[model samples]
Target chain A: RTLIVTTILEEPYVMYRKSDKPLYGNDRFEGYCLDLLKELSNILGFLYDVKLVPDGKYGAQNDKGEWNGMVKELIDHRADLAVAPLTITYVREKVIDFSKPFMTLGISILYRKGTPIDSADDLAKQTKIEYGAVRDGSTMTFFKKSKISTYEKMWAFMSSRQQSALVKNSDEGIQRVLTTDYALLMESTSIEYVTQRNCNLTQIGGLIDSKGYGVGTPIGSPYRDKITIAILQLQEEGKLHMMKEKWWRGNGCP
Target chain B: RTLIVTTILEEPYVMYRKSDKPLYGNDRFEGYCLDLLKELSNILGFLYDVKLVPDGKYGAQNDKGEWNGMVKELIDHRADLAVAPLTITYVREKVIDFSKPFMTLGISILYRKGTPIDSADDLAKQTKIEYGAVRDGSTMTFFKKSKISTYEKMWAFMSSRQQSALVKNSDEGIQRVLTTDYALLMESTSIEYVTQRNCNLTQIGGLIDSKGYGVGTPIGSPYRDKITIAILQLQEEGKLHMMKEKWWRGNGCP
Candidate 1:
């Protein structure tokens, strides 16, 4: 029987059909992370299918303790695993098990075109280097944990009264940074999309120190070892490189 | 009163004086290793004076287990500690204790300038690359322990009539490489000296493996801890950098 894997419409990961026609669900999915999972499924003797779910519904299911979204889908017996840019943090590990990280990524500040922020040193010195990020999550926590000496001063400068200006998705965050003089600190995977599309928004040189992305499954799942072994074998066989080529086009950024 | 630390001539450490210059034991001593030792002595509530002993006698004393060299003298109640390019190894640890390693070093290959050899890849492909070292002991043991796939083949090609050609000291090994096409595999310190002298030899990229060096004292001696603490303190204070500049002429190869 084919295993159902939960995924999201993460551009460059899972995105719209680029053929100028509207296509939804599995037809819209194409990316490095997804490619890796597909190659891995073959090696581990499993047939897998991808399912697209809204981010809000995904989180609701995760919180409602149902198998509707990626994290909860695995737990509620809806999917075998979630293969997105699923971050491996300590909190997530409490409920879900993670495979050894196949890729390392971090929070990166994307600056609008012609910004004076050339490096971390320059960013620290500039008063105009306004920064933004998503609300109350790993990315924001990463910024706070940067502990880069100027973090407090920068945070004090960026905070506002209205919900801290949290955006719902990375596309909106990237758009805001590109349209205004502001900078957005998002997962590096998110930044790569807008940075490639727009010439103005550039990823800053310094990455906010954080953990990388890994495969996630329900806690205590018996298939954990098999999944882990398969991923490592793929890494050893250079399947990760092939996946990067398939999705990244030729950038080789990761 | 300053403790007189007698040492033997070892390039990049202490060495012999030129005959044309009139000098005493104190005047003959100089190197990055000596300066680091002296700084430690000052911080440890002791004074140190660097002096040189005849090279041949120093080796003989070490081999014969006589209380003549600096470490032996320290144990026999002469000097307090001995420090130079004193390599810390498992065998030496039996008769003498060492401070936390002051510097890390490794055995590497030095070849005549303009030689096509660069890395292990080059070494493996060509039987033309001649390898030599100071006659079999700790230095040659490094070659034996290395996991290189082609080492056995190289060994067979280079050995002389059922015995490998090993020199008595680094200087002889380096001299042979300089005078001929033979590549001298010896301590990086000795290679640094050869490169600095603009001798016909240069070190290959890096070591096949890594090792370290430390200050030696008598086994179970009370002075070991005091010297170790002082050396670690100097390392933290950046005094080692200053000392290195005074002796090695600030050649920051390692």
Candidate 2:
């Protein structure tokens, strides 16, 4: 089957550009996920085409209980696979099936090189500095779902802070972290990739919570079993790790 | 040759008693590291004896630049192996050698149940609740070594606090956190183990800094290679993870 694989442009995961030079199809994009898709295609013996999500959102449910972004594409059967750094969360799992995790990561703090905030504790101890997360991302969802009194107070503080700290996407969040006194709460894997390329930024603290990223398919898709098996084999053979080392760390970032 | 393994008594890592019953030698103690030592010994074809460090210090250099505790024992060649949850740090690595990390952890805040403080930022933002750490441990070293203005200010804040905030050991730090409105800054692994057993305690915020625990050895110990190989093999075979699950999380704690 020639599967339609939908993805979003998250650096180190999927990076793309409209070519002034004539580039076409999969050749128009590059990154960890692109390479991973190639390997998966080889292993699973399937032909596939890759396309960027139209709306540029990773995926989230709207207030009207409708999905958008790559997730929606998978749900609507517009795409056969959603293959990016999309996290395998419980809420998403109900609507879509995730293959065995291809990668694991957690929420972390991203800050400029000289930010006084090193940990969330340090961020909480000071009143002058401001921090934020993507408005509709997992980090925000984490705070909202927190029942612990400490996180409850944390959510309250973040919500009541004078200025709006929400960003529309990771790119804006990274920019905010670089240009202002703002620390961006984001996934550690992306922060790892970002900090390598831009020495002026660093991730602070260990992960707040652990999660995994997996290949997403619509619920009850027959291909989930085959895809999961291929991912497990890749993991055992250490190809996944080698790819991560190649893209995330060994790409010549000082 | 029988290797003299120097370790410290840390909960979930090493637990011991000066027995009234008939228990002797390595069999007298139980915990994560003890089992690890047994596995290493079996794999490397060596007999081993485990002893607690006399002064009960992980290891640090005094102003005179003399080492003490488990590190000192290894450096002075009093012990051939230092098998505990000893962290591998640059300063320590200069005097001794460490195997590949067996576990990775970070500094975390251990707080009592219902504490309003969540992150270190929360602690810094409020004045009512007090927080502290081991006087001579890495957590204190981290704050003192921090060059960031916010953390420098935080260090100043911590320094100006009353004498009650600083404790001499992890035990006292945990006790302080349990008994009063105090948050104890310590390693995350310890915090995880403690929180599981003690329902009234929990960790706050993400880890402040990340580091790893390695099997320590004399600077030029021949066993280093063998130990590293065994550790690698165990890690690959999933023995290390299985042991962690068996000891750290398997204990009946809610």
Candidate 3:
């Protein structure tokens, strides 16, 4: 049987096809997400149609507590799987079942090559650096639930320029990072994936705290363990490393 | 309600009391298994009684397919959990439930400090070196099912030795390695755990096949999900690694 897998667009996760002319179905996409889905399919022995979220948002809930985008696709049962770089969070857990995470990373600062900015403590200690992360992300959630004094004060700064400090997406914040003094506070993963392609970018610090991106299934989806076992097998087999190496691999940068 | 837990005596996993006075109940036992069981009970809020398997085997089935030891306790519904270095295997997986594995390891060669054996390939390349695993453990099971050419030849040597190479348990295997030129091909975990306690021994090779030790439960046990979720949660929280640090922590060797 086939499953409908919903995902979002991001470099090396779900990229537009390199072919210029119009392509069809799964042929229209290529990237890490596609390869992962392919591996999952091969191991779990299932078929899937990989499609983009209609609204193109990764996922965010309103103050009203309703979800949209890829997450909602799973919530509404439009897709059996949301195989994306979708970060797992407590709020999201209430609505969807996540397979054990396939990739682990932590919050990091994506900055231009420069003088020391080695940890979140330094970023928190000073305000001049102007750091912000992808809005509506686990990083944002971490700050919102920030209890530690350091991060609590950091949140004060983030909340102060709420509209300006955070960008709507990685694209906007990443653009801000490359073009201006503002540094991007995102997961070490995206930092690694992006910086590999553009040498001007580099990860500034070690992980602030760790998190993982899991394959999301709607509540009560039996495929949760199916994906989990397959994931565990791939992890043990060193298959995951191969996928990430090829997917995140980039051309040499000057 | 209290669940019955089965375990064994294996270094810091389950060790005898040091006090002169005889102890009783869970008080009689201590080690990593106790701490892990304690942590699991704390989060999941369940009562448990820790006990030893009467036959005292980790787990093995007859050629006739009957099982004994801690693994049998879970299958026979005599214990609600088996929290020890119980390796997850396909045969046991068919008979009982295993929470997501708490530890990851693979079959390895437990040898003297200088075998120059870094991998199975290296071990197979040599003929003078004498090696065998615990006679009835997963390593033995793997060799029994070995289809690869390297492992097939290795199995022939192992079978030819019969009583000479095989040992009943890790204790015998470890003792054999210490007293002779023989190497014990077994799980990397027991080697690391034992080597940490006695510096003269070290793991000689990389893992031959990866496996994990999951908490065992009876098939159809309602608590399986509870345990799986808790295991994943602790793993995410860094709690599991912390527990391992304290339990596996050993005095430095001179």
Candidate 4:
């Protein structure tokens, strides 16, 4: 069966081609996930077409409880698979199925080099620098989940500050970290990639929360098992780890 | 029964008195571990005396299978307890008992700010930058345990480097990182404490491995039960975390 694979354009995960020559099909994009999709197709014996999520989101629920982004596409049956750095979370899992995690990561702080902010406690105690996470992402959800009073106070503090503190995307958040007195709460994996290329930025503190990325499909999709098995096999043979090294490290940062 | 606690003089974990007036008992020393021992004593209703380990080593087995340092004191029955940031390791557990981990940590990289090294992969790929861990510490032990070829290769690279790379203690390792093109592989907790004080230095890379610090007792010591219960209670009540913040972060660093 020809499957429709949905993804979001994120650096090192999935990137648009910058070639002078015209490109078509899968050749138009290249990244860790793209390579992963190719390997999965080779093993699972399926033909697939790739497209970007129309909303350019990983996935999140709004006040009305409506899902959006790559997750929304899958829930609406518009796509057969989501093969991006989409984090596997509880809310998303209720509406869709995810194969075994292909990658694991956690929330971390992204700050400019030399920032005195080393840990969340430091950020909480200091007032000069502002910190934030993507409005709809799991990093923000972390504050909502924290029962600690300090975190609750921090959440309230962030809400009371200027709306400019909240960012639309990881790239924008990272850019703010570079140009402003800000620290971006983001996925550690992305922070690792960004820090490699930009020596001026660094990740601080231990992970706030650990999670994983899985091949997401509509709930009960038969493909979940096959994909999970494929992922597990790749993990066992060390191909998944090698791909991470290739895309995250070996691909030299400019 | 009174317990004989053997600890090492590590800054922030255990510190020598700076006062001119001669002090007696635990008052002569102050640090995170000292405070923890006080609390543990209060809860467990035990009287204890603290002394520095004669050799100032955390403990490691020699080629002859003889243990040295704090581990030796415990194994030799010279000390009833090891109440410092003593790591719980497989080899040591065979000879002594440990309370449940009071604090969890992992191996990390300590480097100067703007060093252009962010991860283990970066360190492995770059040639000019040098890295080392405390000789006979768990960080070095990690390389020996890793079956991954990259880690094996990294172990060989570090082993082949100059003897100057391996330092006698964590402070010496951090000092070398400050003065030269060097990175120190160290426990993350120690790195957190060091970076808070030395703004010029920071920890890079995710933890290479995770372990914990536990109160040490001689094998089959009846006190292990009471100590473990106290630790669990402290953890459950968040006192352990509170104490860590109080000593590690609240202690102002200039």
Best by DockQ: 3
lDDT tens digits by residue: candidate 1, A1-254: 87777777776766556678877646666777667777777777787777764443333223554434476777667777778777655345546666655665566777766555676456556666556677555665444444445655555544655635456667677777767666777877666666666765678876544344667777666666466556645543446645654665534222
Q: Is candidate 1 or candidate 3 better by TM-score?
A: 3
Error of 2 at B65 (Å): 0.5
Kindly list the per-residue Cα lDDT of model 1 for residues B1-254, writing each as its tens digit: 57666566677677555668777756665667667766766777676776554333232133555644455565565555666666554345545666655665567778866756787557656756567566544555445544445655555555655544567777777667766667776777667666877545678878554344567666666666566566645643446545654554534434
TM-score of each: 0.49, 0.53, 0.76, 0.54
Any runs in candidate 1 off by more than 4 Å, and if so which? A18-25, A54-69, A113-115, A120-126, A144-148, A163-165, A192-194, A250-254, B1-254
- Tens digit per residue, CA lDDT, model 3, A56-133: 877788888889988899999999999888886656766788876687777888988866887778888997888776
* Two-chain DockQ for each candidate model: 0.03, 0.02, 0.16, 0.03
lDDT for each residue of candidate 4 in B1-254, tens digit (9 for 90 to 100): 68899998887888877898988988889988888988988997888899999887888888899999999999999999998888766567667877656787777889987766779888877668888888888677666556677677677777884555678888789888988888888999999999988888888987765566789889878787567667755654457777888878834546
Residue-by-residue lDDT tens digits, candidate 2, B1-254: 79899998887889875667888888789989988998999998999889889998999999999999999999999999998888766567668877756776778889987756778888877668877778877777777776645556567767774645679888888888878788888889889888887888888989765566789999778887467667756653457777877876734554
Report the TM-score of candidate 2, chain A only. Answer: 0.92
lDDT of 4 by residue, A1-254 (tens): 69999998888999988999999987889999999999999989999999888988889988998989999999999999999998866567668877756877778889988756788888877668988888878778777666677677667666775655678888789888889899988899999999998888888988765566889999768787578667755654457878988988834543
How high is the DockQ of candidate 1? 0.03
Leading candidate by TM-score? 3
Clashes of each: 3, 12, 0, 0
Residue A141 displacement in candidate 4 (angstroms): 21
